Amino acid sequence: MASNFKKANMASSSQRKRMSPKPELTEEQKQEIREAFDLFDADGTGTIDVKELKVAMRALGFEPKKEEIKKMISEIDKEGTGKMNFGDFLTVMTQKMS
């Protein structure tokens, strides 16, 4: 089916307790990059766009340093405009803060 015919998930079993961190990103970082990218990519697709990713940067930034939220949105909007997958969002947002 191409169009949205409704009734995907009615009973919302929202399991925020799955991977406990080993030598990796911790509770604060795990929650903010998973829960923002999964809020825009809900059913399991791949890429989030600059409209959705700018709303993701407003919720994730809060209070930041200087060239962080404007630098991510203007640097991936370049060759075929702005599209981001989860490997880009995880590596660029964790290495710029941690």
Curated annotation (Swiss-Prot):
Q: Does the keyword Cell cycle apply?
A: yes
Region (Required for self-assembly) location: 2-25
Localisation? Cytoplasm, Cytoskeleton, Microtubule organizing center, Centrosome; Cytoplasm, Cytoskeleton, Microtubule organizing center, Centrosome, Centriole; Nucleus envelope; Nucleus, Nuclear pore complex
> Among its keywords, does the record have ATP-binding?
no
- Please tell me which positions the record assigns to the cross-link Glycyl lysine isopeptide (Lys-Gly) (interchain with G-Cter in SUMO2): 22
The source's domain of life comes to Eukaryota
**Chief subcellular site?**
cytoplasm
Ranges for the EF-hand domain? 28-63, 64-98
Using the record's annotations, give every residue carrying the modification Phosphoserine: 20
A GO cellular component term found in this entry reads:
apical part of cell
Q: Which residues carry this modification: Phosphothreonine?
A: 26
Molecular functions per Gene Ontology: calcium ion binding; G-protein beta/gamma-subunit complex binding; heterotrimeric G-protein binding; microtubule binding
In the record, biological process GO terms are: cell division; centriole replication; microtubule cytoskeleton organization; mitotic cell cycle; mRNA transport; nucleotide-excision repair; protein transport; regulation of cytokinesis
| PTM annotation (N-acetylalanine): residues | 2
List residues binding Ca(2+) 1: 41, 43, 45, 47, 52
Region called Disordered, residue ranges: 1-30
Q: Which UniProt keywords apply?
A: Acetylation, Calcium, Cell cycle, Cell division, Cytoplasm, Cytoskeleton, DNA damage, DNA repair, Isopeptide bond, Metal-binding, Mitosis, mRNA transport, Nuclear pore complex, Nucleus, Phosphoprotein, Protein transport, Repeat, Translocation, Transport, Ubl conjugation
What does the record's miscellaneous section state?
Binds two moles of calcium per mole of protein.
Give the family per the record.
Belongs to the centrin family.
What function is annotated for this protein? Plays a fundamental role in microtubule organizing center structure and function. Required for centriole duplication and correct spindle formation. Has a role in regulating cytokinesis and genome stability via cooperation with CALM1 and CCP110.
Subunit info here reads: Monomer. Homooligomer. Interacts with SFI1. Interacts with CCP110. Component of the XPC complex composed of XPC, RAD23B and CETN2. Component of the nuclear pore complex (NPC)-associated TREX-2 complex (transcription and export complex 2), composed of at least GANP, 2 copies of ENY2, PCID2, SEM1/DSS1, and either centrin CETN2 or centrin CETN3. The TREX-2 complex also associates with ALYREF/ALY and with the nucleoporin NUP153. Interacts with USP49. Forms a microtubule-associated complex with POC5, POC1B and FAM161A. Interacts with CCDC15.
Record protein name field: Centrin-2
Q: What are the leading ranks of the lineage?
A: Eukaryota, Metazoa, Chordata, Craniata, Vertebrata
